[PDB]
DNA sequence: GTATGGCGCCATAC
DNA sequence: GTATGGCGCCATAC
């Protein structure tokens, strides 16, 4: 209940972290990994995963988009448009490209590239 | 293209009339019936129908709600909450209650009842 | 029971 | 081809 506020158009992201924290409060020690990672981009951070839809897309308060794009745009670049502006760092084990069963929504595992 | 502007949070209704006009430009003389009806509540008005979903609900720019509630709230009471505040007039042949195959979204075929 | 909202699937706009 | 968005179906909150 207060985890959402601490992790935090504003009312749409609020609905998005909400969608997220519900998935993370269920995973083991998962909320903890994320709270630390919002603090330091340079400090090492563990992967925080959510399940992957067949589509790839995640729908949040009736808007539908890719998960790492969503949570980056909540926590880093609010002007972020599409996944092309994103690229995964070398740190991350479950990037969106990976097509693996889970997908990392830790916002600092990706850098923004304006092509 | 200009029909939408003439029939006309504002940018969500704009997306809704858009969803609508596309269905009406396909029906025969249907756009015409609606243009007249936005003018006069007291003047007699023909039914303007759209298809009915099994659910009943209509999704518009990612929000989902009942059709007569949507188009009433666009064109009459913007503070309208649920379908309980609505009741169909005696004029209408395809009210939402009717569960018929089409459904009348002419905003003036319904009156608002605060219970 | 009713209300509400996401996902897989599909249809349509570039 | 990629992007985008609605509907039927289902799962969950009252
Ligand atoms: Zn990662
Ligand atoms: Zn009618």
The DSSP secondary structure of B17-41, one letter per residue, reads HHHHHHHHHHSTTHHHHHHHHTT-S
Instruction: Give the rounded distance of the alpha carbon of A33 from its chain centre.
Output: 12
B9, two tokens: 């949070």
Residue B104 and residue B71 in contact, taking contact as beta carbons nearer than 8 Å: no
Q: Which of these, B114, B101, B8, lies nearest to B51 by C-alpha position?
A: B101
Could you tell me which residues are beta bridge partners of residue A49? A104
Q: Which segments of B are annotated as binding site for Zn(2+)? A: 47, 92, 104, 109
Residue B93 per-residue DSSP state: S
Taking any CB pair shorter than 8 Å as contact, residues of chain A touching chain B are 59, 62-64
Give the resolution value in Å. Answer: 3.1
Rounded to whole angstroms, how far apart are CA atoms A19 and A95?
Answer: 19
List the Cα angle A114/B62/A95 in 5-degree steps: 40
Rounded to whole angstroms, how far apart are CA atoms A18 and A61?
Answer: 10
List the Cα angle A66/A67/A73 in 5-degree steps: 95
Q: How was this structure determined?
A: X-ray
B55, two tokens: 């659910």
Residue B15's SS3 state is helix
Any residues with CB less than 8 A from the CB of B15 and at least 6 apart, and which? B60, B61
Report the 10 Å Cβ neighbour count for B112.
Answer: 12
CATH class for domain B1-115? alpha beta
Residue B104 and residue B47 in contact, taking contact as beta carbons nearer than 8 Å: yes
Closest C1' nucleotide to B59's CA: D6
Residue B40 approaches strand D within 7 Å at CB:
no
- Name the CA radius of gyration of chain A, rounded: 13
Report the 10 Å Cβ neighbour count for A83.
Answer: 17
Q: Do you know the residue count of chain A?
A: 115
Rounded to whole angstroms, how far apart are CA atoms B40 and B54?
Answer: 32
Rounded to whole angstroms, how far apart are CA atoms A104 and A94?
Answer: 5
């Amino acid at each position: 209940s207060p985890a959402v506020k601490r992790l935090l158009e504003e009312k749409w992201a609020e609905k998005a972290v909400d969608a997220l924290v519900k998935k993370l409060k269920k995973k083991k020690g998962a909320m903890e990994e994320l709270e630390k990672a919002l603090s330091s981009p340079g400090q090492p951070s563990k992967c925080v995963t959510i399940p992957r839809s067949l589509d790839g897309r995640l729908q949040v308060s009736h808007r539908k988009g890719l998960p790492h794009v969503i949570y980056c745009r909540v926590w880093r670049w609010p002007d972020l448009q599409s996944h092309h502006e994103l690229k995964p760092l070398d740190i991350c084990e479950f990037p969106f490209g990976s097509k693996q069963k889970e997908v990392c929504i830790n916002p600092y595992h990706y850098k923004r590239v304006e092509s």
